[PDB]
Structure formats: structure tokens, C-alpha cells
């Protein structure tokens, strides 16, 4: 069927979710940046620190990869579960990555065509 | 460093990991055909060894 | 050379016997020169341990003896022969090691 | 088992809790109006080292920790 | 433990291709019986069985000197959740069974 970007999205962070990674914090970002395991990005609307936005977009020039900026990404990052084994602490998240690949081995999609084709404008 | 520095010194003479096979006992333990128990278990369990009393 | 030999062992001499009866049976079942069954002496391992867990009372011991019995049948026979006769369903308790030279 | 009296030295098997800034940047350096980075950070041949881990190197030989290279400035 | 969470869903994994195993009663170990040169820390093997113990999920029957694994369906279920894995992965020994 019919499946556009914004569906793609809760897509890709599935599978990000299911090979766990969605790395946090400040430190050990640009990791898998460096050697072009992870080829895709995700970027949540409006920003609440400078620095971070601007850390994030010289890294993006660093690299050569061009960013997309989504609105209301917290609930399509939320609707897979970001509980951390059960409900003792709570989880904290503002860019979403999906590290280190991006479609699984043996659960392919058309949403990776569609995701691509708008990720490499 | 501990992961590359574990179980650093061999201790092969000794038996405190080779003590008695069945359980954390010590003092006693006989090396005959290889038992590796103290004479508690080996007693107790001596039935399905295949060790008989009748001298 | 095609002469087989069976070193069986067992704790008991009647099942032992058995097992070398039916043995030298299927052998004599067809045309097989066969020796006799070779007794090798029987191993007698001593334990002897005190019998008390803590040291106390009068000085006791157990003596657990274990009497190995082993008997050896060499049959000038390939082995397969041999193995078509081994399944009788063995007396349990009877191990048999398989020499061919 | 009896009490084996701690009570002159500091009876704490505890390990360090510090606290500090949640913006923590010190493998880059911001406000400098550059894209590319000017390598300070000792390039490192390990397999395990990408653009987000690298080290500081002080007056006092070369520290490590992660493949036990040595870079001594000294 | 200070031991990665890649390693323990490896161990998850090395578990689920089996249902039940046996871990020795030791902590000075450096390697698994089954997991043998496998960086897996017999230690953290009666920590993994430990956990799930608190979880209530699994059970042991300890015998001389030997930790003894269980698992119930919802312990089943668990692990294949935490695998972030389709149940698919049945033990093997039914199919050779």
C-alpha cells in the first residue's frame, strides 16, 4: 500500500528499537558518523539548547549528510517504548537516531525507498 | 586491568577448587581411583558407587 | 588378522557368566573356532573409612571391597560376525571393550 | 560472623559520585567559527576509537586505557 | 555489572537455542562449560540467573555443587522479548527429535 515518510518514520524507529542503539547524551555520538555505519537521521521540531542544534549541524557538515527535520517526532519515538526494563526511572530523549544501518537482514520494506529518496535531497 | 589479570597466580597443588565433588567440604577428601569426596558423601552415597561391605 | 577379542568386565561374576554362555553360544551358533573364556584375576579395591563424620568413639572403619571380574573371549572371526551376535540385549552392568589386531 | 570494627579509618567501600555540567565537551571546541577541527586530539590507531572517543594527553607521559598505546611527549 | 547489555543478550540468545543448561558453582572462573572462550564470565552466568531469580521467572535445582536452570513460558516470553526477536527460534533439539 500507500506509505509515505511519516509512516516511515515510526518504521525506522522500530528497527531502530529492535537492534536497541538510540544512543543518548552528549558523549560517544560520532562513533558510527566517522566510518558511515548509519545512514539515516531524524531531527525533532523547533530546538531547546543552541549548542546541541549547533554541534549537530557541524557535525552533519563534518560528515557530508544532510539532516531531516520532522514535527511531533516525540510521540512517533514514544509509540515504540523507550521504557529501560520496567517502570523504575524514566526516559529523557531529544534527536532521534537510527544508528549503525538502516533496514534489517531478513525484514526488508518499501519505506526504506521512499525514506531514502527523502533523505538524500 | 582486572579481566586481563584474572586467576592470575595457577594454583594447581592445591584443592579448594578441587575439593570434594559433591558439595563445600573439605577435610577428609581420599583420591582413591579418583573419588574426589570426603568421607561423608562417599559413605552416604557408597551404595551406587558399586563398593560393598561384606569382609 | 581376523581375530576378535572381547574384553568384558562386570561386578558380577553370575551376569558375567551369562553374558560369556550366551556369547560363546551364538559364536557356537555358527562356524566359529572359539577359545575358551580367559579369567583374568578378579580386582579387589579396598576402601576403608572411618565411619563416624566427626572424630569420636571407638576407632571404626567400613571396608567397602569392589571385586572387578573380567573374562576375554578372542574368536577367530571378523567382527562383524561378532557384533550381529552382540545384539541380545547385553546384561546391563557388562562393559565390553573391542580388541582387533 | 562478629563485627570486625571499623571505626578508625574511613569504613567506606563505596565508589566516587561527582557531579557535573550535562553539556560535558571536551573531544571538540565550540565558538570558533570553523567547520573542520583543528587536530589537538592525539589520533588514535585503535579499532575502537571514532570521531566521539579520543584523548588528552598531559605533562606526565601519555595516558591510555583503551588499547595501551603510548604517544610521550615528555 | 560492568559488563555490556550486548554480551548479556548474547548470552540470552546462546540460552534460547537450548532450554535448559547447567552452570558450575564457581565465581574464580574464567570461562563457561558451554561458553567455552566466549568472553562469558561464569560469575556473571549466576548473575544473569540471579537476576531472573529476583524477576521470579526461572528456578534452579542445585546438586552437587551445580546450579541447575529452569524456564516457564512466561520466562520464555520475556527473553524473546528482550531479544527484540520473533519466537521463531524453538529449541533445536525438536528438531532433532
Same mark, same amino acid.
Given at each position: 500500500?500507500?506509505?509515505?515518510?511519516?509512516?516511515?518514520?515510526?518504521?525506522?524507529?522500530?528497527?531502530?528499537?529492535?537492534?536497541?542503539?538510540?544512543?543518548?547524551?552528549?558523549?560517544?555520538?560520532?562513533?558510527?558518523?566517522?566510518?558511515?555505519?548509519?545512514?539515516?537521521?531524524?531531527?525533532?521540531?523547533?530546538?531547546?539548547?543552541?549548542?546541541?542544534?549547533?554541534?549537530?549541524?557541524?557535525?552533519?557538515?563534518?560528515?557530508?549528510?544532510?539532516?531531516?527535520?520532522?514535527?511531533?517526532?516525540?510521540?512517533?519515538?514514544?509509540?515504540?517504548?523507550?521504557?529501560?526494563?520496567?517502570?523504575?526511572?524514566?526516559?529523557?530523549?531529544?534527536?532521534?537516531?537510527?544508528?549503525?544501518?538502516?533496514?534489517?537482514?531478513?525484514?526488508?520494506?518499501?519505506?526504506?525507498?521512499?525514506?531514502?529518496?527523502?533523505?538524500?535531497? | 586491568?582486572?579481566?586481563?589479570?584474572?586467576?592470575?597466580?595457577?594454583?594447581?597443588?592445591?584443592?579448594?577448587?578441587?575439593?570434594?565433588?559433591?558439595?563445600?567440604?573439605?577435610?577428609?577428601?581420599?583420591?582413591?581411583?579418583?573419588?574426589?569426596?570426603?568421607?561423608?558423601?562417599?559413605?552416604?552415597?557408597?551404595?551406587?558407587?558399586?563398593?560393598?561391605?561384606?569382609? | 588378522?581376523?581375530?576378535?577379542?572381547?574384553?568384558?568386565?562386570?561386578?558380577?561374576?553370575?551376569?558375567?557368566?551369562?553374558?560369556?554362555?550366551?556369547?560363546?553360544?551364538?559364536?557356537?551358533?555358527?562356524?566359529?573356532?572359539?577359545?575358551?573364556?580367559?579369567?583374568?584375576?578378579?580386582?579387589?579395591?579396598?576402601?576403608?573409612?572411618?565411619?563416624?563424620?566427626?572424630?569420636?568413639?571407638?576407632?571404626?572403619?567400613?571396608?567397602?571391597?569392589?571385586?572387578?571380574?573380567?573374562?576375554?573371549?578372542?574368536?577367530?572371526?571378523?567382527?562383524?560376525?561378532?557384533?550381529?551376535?552382540?545384539?541380545?540385549?547385553?546384561?546391563?552392568?557388562?562393559?565390553?571393550?573391542?580388541?582387533?589386531? | 560472623?562478629?563485627?570486625?570494627?571499623?571505626?578508625?579509618?574511613?569504613?567506606?567501600?563505596?565508589?566516587?559520585?561527582?557531579?557535573?555540567?550535562?553539556?560535558?565537551?571536551?573531544?571538540?571546541?565550540?565558538?570558533?567559527?570553523?567547520?573542520?577541527?583543528?587536530?589537538?586530539?592525539?589520533?588514535?590507531?585503535?579499532?575502537?576509537?571514532?570521531?566521539?572517543?579520543?584523548?588528552?594527553?598531559?605533562?606526565?607521559?601519555?595516558?591510555?586505557?583503551?588499547?595501551?598505546?603510548?604517544?610521550?611527549?615528555? | 555489572?560492568?559488563?555490556?547489555?550486548?554480551?548479556?543478550?548474547?548470552?540470552?540468545?546462546?540460552?534460547?537455542?537450548?532450554?535448559?543448561?547447567? $552452570?558450575?558453582?564457581?565465581?574464580?572462573?574464567?570461562?563457561?562449560? *558451554?561458553?567455552?572462550?566466549?568472553?562469558?564470565?561464569? #560469575? =556473571?552466568?549466576?548473575?544473569?540467573?540471579?537476576?531472573?531469580?529476583?524477576?521470579?521467572?526461572?528456578?534452579?535445582?542445585? $546438586?552437587?555443587?551445580?546450579?541447575?536452570?529452569?524456564?516457564?513460558? *512466561?520466562?520464555?516470553?520475556?527473553?524473546?522479548?528482550? #531479544? =527484540?526477536?520473533?519466537?521463531?527460534?524453538?529449541?533445536?533439539?525438536?528438531?532433532?527429535?
Amino acid at each position: 500500500g500507500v506509505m509515505d515518510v511519516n509512516t516511515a518514520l515510526q518504521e525506522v524507529l522500530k528497527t531502530a528499537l529492535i537492534h536497541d542503539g538510540l544512543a543518548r547524551g552528549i558523549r560517544e555520538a560520532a562513533k558510527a558518523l566517522d566510518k558511515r555505519q548509519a545512514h539515516l537521521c531524524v531531527l525533532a521540531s523547533n530546538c531547546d539548547e543552541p549548542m546541541y542544534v549547533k554541534l549537530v549541524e557541524a557535525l552533519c557538515a563534518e560528515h557530508q549528510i544532510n539532516l531531516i527535520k520532522v514535527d511531533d517526532n516525540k510521540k512517533l519515538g514514544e509509540w515504540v517504548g523507550l521504557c529501560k526494563i520496567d517502570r523504575e526511572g524514566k526516559p529523557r530523549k531529544v534527536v532521534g537516531c537510527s544508528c549503525v544501518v538502516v533496514k534489517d537482514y531478513g525484514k526488508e520494506s518499501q519505506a526504506k525507498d521512499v525514506i531514502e529518496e527523502y533523505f538524500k535531497c | 586491568g582486572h579481566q586481563q589479570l584474572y586467576w592470575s597466580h595457577p594454583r594447581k597443588f592445591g584443592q579448594g577448587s578441587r575439593s570434594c565433588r559433591v558439595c563445600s567440604n573439605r577435610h577428609g577428601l581420599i583420591r582413591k581411583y579418583g573419588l574426589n569426596m570426603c568421607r561423608q558423601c562417599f559413605r552416604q552415597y557408597a551404595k551406587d558407587i558399586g563398593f560393598i561391605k561384606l569382609d | 588378522i581376523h581375530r576378535i577379542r572381547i574384553t568384558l568386565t562386570s561386578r558380577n561374576v553370575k551376569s558375567l557368566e551369562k553374558v560369556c554362555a550366551d556369547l560363546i553360544r551364538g559364536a557356537k551358533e555358527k562356524n566359529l573356532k572359539v577359545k575358551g573364556p580367559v579369567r583374568m584375576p578378579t580386582k579387589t579395591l579396598r576402601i576403608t573409612t572411618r565411619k563416624t563424620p566427626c572424630g569420636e568413639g571407638s576407632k571404626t572403619w567400613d571396608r567397602f571391597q569392589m571385586r572387578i571380574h573380567k573374562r576375554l573371549i578372542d574368536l577367530h572371526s571378523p567382527s562383524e560376525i561378532v557384533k550381529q551376535i552382540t545384539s541380545i540385549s547385553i546384561e546391563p552392568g557388562v562393559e565390553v571393550e573391542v580388541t582387533i589386531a | 560472623k562478629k563485627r570486625k570494627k571499623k571505626s578508625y579509618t574511613t569504613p567506606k567501600k563505596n565508589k566516587h559520585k561527582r557531579k557535573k555540567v550535562k553539556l560535558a565537551v571536551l573531544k571538540y571546541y565550540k565558538v570558533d567559527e570553523n567547520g573542520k577541527i583543528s587536530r589537538l586530539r592525539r589520533e588514535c590507531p585503535s579499532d575502537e576509537c571514532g570521531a566521539g572517543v579520543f584523548m588528552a594527553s598531559h605533562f606526565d607521559r601519555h595516558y591510555c586505557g583503551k588499547c595501551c598505546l603510548t604517544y610521550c611527549f615528555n | 555489572m560492568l559488563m555490556p547489555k550486548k554480551n548479556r543478550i548474547a548470552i540470552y540468545e546462546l540460552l534460547f537455542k537450548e532450554g535448559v543448561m547447567v $552452570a558450575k558453582k564457581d565465581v574464580h572462573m574464567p570461562k563457561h562449560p *558451554e561458553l567455552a572462550d566466549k568472553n562469558v564470565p561464569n #560469575l =556473571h552466568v549466576m548473575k544473569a540467573m540471579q537476576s531472573l531469580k529476583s524477576r521470579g521467572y526461572v528456578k534452579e535445582q542445585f $546438586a552437587w555443587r551445580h546450579f541447575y536452570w529452569y524456564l516457564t513460558n *512466561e520466562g520464555i516470553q520475556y527473553l524473546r522479548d528482550y #531479544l =527484540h526477536l520473533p519466537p521463531e527460534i524453538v529449541p533445536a533439539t525438536l528438531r532433532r527429535s
